[PDB]
Design a binder for this molecule. Structure first.
Ligand SMILES: NS(=O)(=O)c1nnc(NC(=O)CC2CCCCC2)s1
Ligand SMILES: [Zn+2]
Length: 222
């Protein structure tokens, strides 16, 4: 069933579009969130194991996604290795820090051996063109369709050297809004410029950011 960010299909309505999307409205750990107060805790360090891989880029009406057919881009935290299935973008950002909304957000989506989801998010400030993201922008399908990018791609370079993060539990930010998703949101911002935001949006069709969901009982660790 169709869903989106304007009209009757918009997030306020995802629950009612079908039986499967019901959690979108009745969830109590829904993403995104606005990150206000936090608990200072001694979090486990992220280990990054990203390397050049043969990737392919997809526009599906909703977002611009880079998919990894072959495993071997992984991420280790507290003993468990999480495999990157894909990364993708939202303009503007979905999550917020202290009321604040970022020009763009990227979500690196992993599963461990046990099919336990983990999203790693990177927020982008407005600034200089993003040189590392040009490879992907330069062949971004501006209407629905999957090309297959011919230069290996190093997600390595989209992650910062400084890897402090907010930690909470949540959900898919797109239907069916499944919960039980680990969220790790990176304190070091990257950057994109005006041209890049508008181009992603041009292509996707609209702003693609679900509204911030109430934390409820959840604590964000910092
Ligand atoms: N907008 S977002 O970053 O929260 C999303 N990222 N991935 C999404 N869906 C999938 O990755 C497929 C897969 C299917 C079942 C296991 C978990 C997720 S929504
Ligand atoms: Zn996302």
């Amino acid at each position: 069933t169709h869903w989106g960010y304007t009209g009757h299909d918009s997030p306020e309505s995802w629950g009612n579009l079908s039986e499967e999307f019901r959690l979108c409205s009745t969830g109590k750990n829904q993403s995104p969130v606005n990150i206000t107060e936090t608990v200072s805790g001694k979090l486990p360090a992220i280990k990054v194991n990203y390397k050049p891989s043969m990737v392919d880029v997809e526009n599906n009406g909703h977002t611009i996604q880079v998919n990894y057919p072959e495993g071997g881009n992984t991420l280790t935290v507290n003993g468990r290795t999480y495999t990157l299935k894909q990364f993708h973008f939202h303009v503007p950002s979905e999550n917020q820090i202290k009321g604040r909304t970022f020009p763009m957000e990227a979500h690196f989506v992993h599963l461990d051996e046990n099919k336990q989801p983990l999203v790693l998010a990177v927020l982008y400030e407005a600034g200089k063109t993003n040189g590392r993201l040009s490879s992907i922008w330069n062949v971004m399908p501006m209407t629905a369709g999957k090309v297959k990018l011919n230069q290996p791609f190093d997600a390595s370079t989209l992650l910062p050297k400084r890897l402090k993060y907010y930690r909470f539990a949540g959900s898919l930010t797109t239907p069916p809004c499944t919960e039980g998703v680990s969220w790790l949101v990176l304190k070091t911002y990257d950057h994109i410029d005006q041209a890049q935001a508008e181009k992603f949006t041009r292509a996707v069709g609209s702003e693609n950011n679900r509204p911030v969901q109430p934390l409820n009982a959840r604590v964000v660790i910092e």
